[PDB]
Structure 1
Amino acid sequence: EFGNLARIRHVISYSLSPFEQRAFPSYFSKGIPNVLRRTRERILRVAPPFVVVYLIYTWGNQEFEQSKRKNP
């Protein structure tokens, strides 16, 4: 329902045609810092549970391979 969704006053939007602009304007040289910024802002909340459960997995397999070992 375009036309009766919201009420916005005094805003200006500028846009270009896709045929008068580049499809990949400075792709790598402006995309690598943003990807590194997002990774630095999110890896401290995503990664440490995965590191702890990798430690849990390795400890479990180490105990399973250490289960009997011809016990004296």
Structure 2
Amino acid sequence: GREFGHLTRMRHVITYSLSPFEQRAFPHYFTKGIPNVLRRTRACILRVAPPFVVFYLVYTWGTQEFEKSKRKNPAAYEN
């Protein structure tokens, strides 16, 4: 029963549209797009990135302590 004439109630709202053949498919692309994708990067960088930094530090400590527990023996190797 979810068809287009039966969805919700709406009053006093006007929309304006242009034909696709009357406009250019590529407007401002590097004038608007490059400043837009940079503040989107700034808005999410403090939430996503600090977990993946802690994975990097655990990975380096885990592969380096694996080798000098195994056959890397400078000075604890006496009688």
**Structure 1 and Structure 2 fold alike (TM over 0.5):** yes
Which residue matches 2:63? 61
Q: Flag the structure with larger Rg.
A: 2
Q: State the distance in 2 between where 1:23 and 1:11 align.
A: 27
Residues 31-42 of structure 1 mapped to structure 2, 5 A cutoff: 31-42=33-44
Structure 1 residues without counterparts, runs of 5 or longer: none
Q: State the distance in 1 between where 2:63 and 2:27 align.
A: 49
Question: Which stretches of structure 1, 4 residues or longer, exceed 4 Å deviation after superposition?
Answer: none
Structure-2-length-normalised TM-score: 0.82
Which residue matches 1:30? 32
Decide which moves more: 42-51 or 53-62: 53-62
| Higher helix proportion (structure 1 or 2) | 1
Structure-1-length-normalised TM-score: 0.88
